[model samples]
Target: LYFQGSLRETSEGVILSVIVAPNARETKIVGIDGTRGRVKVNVAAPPVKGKANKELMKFFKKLFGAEVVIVRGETSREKDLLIKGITKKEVIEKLEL
Candidate 1:
């Protein structure tokens, strides 16, 4: 499947735009078909649980630079992230799809 408006290829891990669905029973990346800049993440953690939030940050911290932040959609489970110093190409490459 293609994502992020363009297929994300990578020299390093790519930055992604994501939509987090918290309170789910599993943690996985679900492709949002037809969305240009989005990923649907199902996390097995509630909004109050904070596990999903911590996991999200940790995932990004390990995946990208030292400055990943929720650039948008904080209160909502669905969110957008601004990952510093990464590219779409790198992301796709790392994902190896």
Candidate 2:
């Protein structure tokens, strides 16, 4: 199927690219950065001791009601999430981005 630059549908799950900003007022998806090929996400946790990463996982889990795991870039602001039990179209439309 056709996919967005930051989102791919696989046999296992959907892979989503995201750039995170820790310590934001609220954890949310600000927009899709098409140029960078990632979703712009801001988190409400500090960039310390894996809090931001956990926050990201929690936020996505709550938002999508799916299991979300960090696929890549765990040590950086840019991350790829493996979201199970969801489709690329559902994700794109559900996010309201």
Candidate 3:
């Protein structure tokens, strides 16, 4: 119970705000520091032809084991994601934040 944060719950699922850094050396989670109200993630793929977005979903699948959908900001660094079949507690535990 060391982590504290917020997310939106909707009929679709829980919405997660993310700030992504593409073209990094490797893909990894930076942390949820509440900067601009979004969790930071570093991706290895480039920000071209939707490669980074695919990588983001793949990485999150391995991290959270839930369905990830980009609800907004498809062409921007900041993105809103909808994750189904997962909880905030589980996310905190898996990320260890």
Candidate 4:
């Protein structure tokens, strides 16, 4: 499998680059777009009042089957997510891309 979005191993964990679209009609993973250097995610929560961020954390927590934390860009659409209890290989396999 080949992944376009950059994934790196950090002291904390594997970092997942993400670009989010909040307030969508439905919440789902659109897939990873390498050209954008981020995984495209759509969430049902609005971007205001921290609802989207909360939803994002929940979404990733379920996806990785572990605790997920926002390491950077919490207030921006582009974010760096630290996935615990998973490896870069696991992430790629889970994405199935």
TM-score of each: 0.67, 0.90, 0.84, 0.87
Local error of candidate 3 at residue 77 (angstroms)? 0.3
Q: Candidate 4: where are CA atoms >4 Å away?
A: 1-4
TM-score of 2: 0.90
Model 3 residue 46 CA deviation (Å) reads 0.6
- True-structure RMSD, every candidate: 4.2, 2.4, 2.1, 1.8
Give me the candidate number with maximum lDDT. 2
lDDT agreement of model 3 with the native: 0.79
Clashes per candidate (backbone, < 3 Å)? 6, 0, 0, 0
> Which lDDT values do the candidates have, in the order given?
0.62, 0.87, 0.79, 0.82
lDDT of 4 by residue, 21-69 (tens): 9989877888787786788889899999989989999987887798888
Higher-scoring candidate on TM-score, 1 or 4: 4
Candidate that would win on TM-score: 2
Candidate 1 lDDT score at position 49: 55
Say which prediction, candidate 2 or candidate 3, comes out ahead on lDDT. Answer: 2
Provide the global lDDT of candidate 4 against the true structure. Answer: 0.82
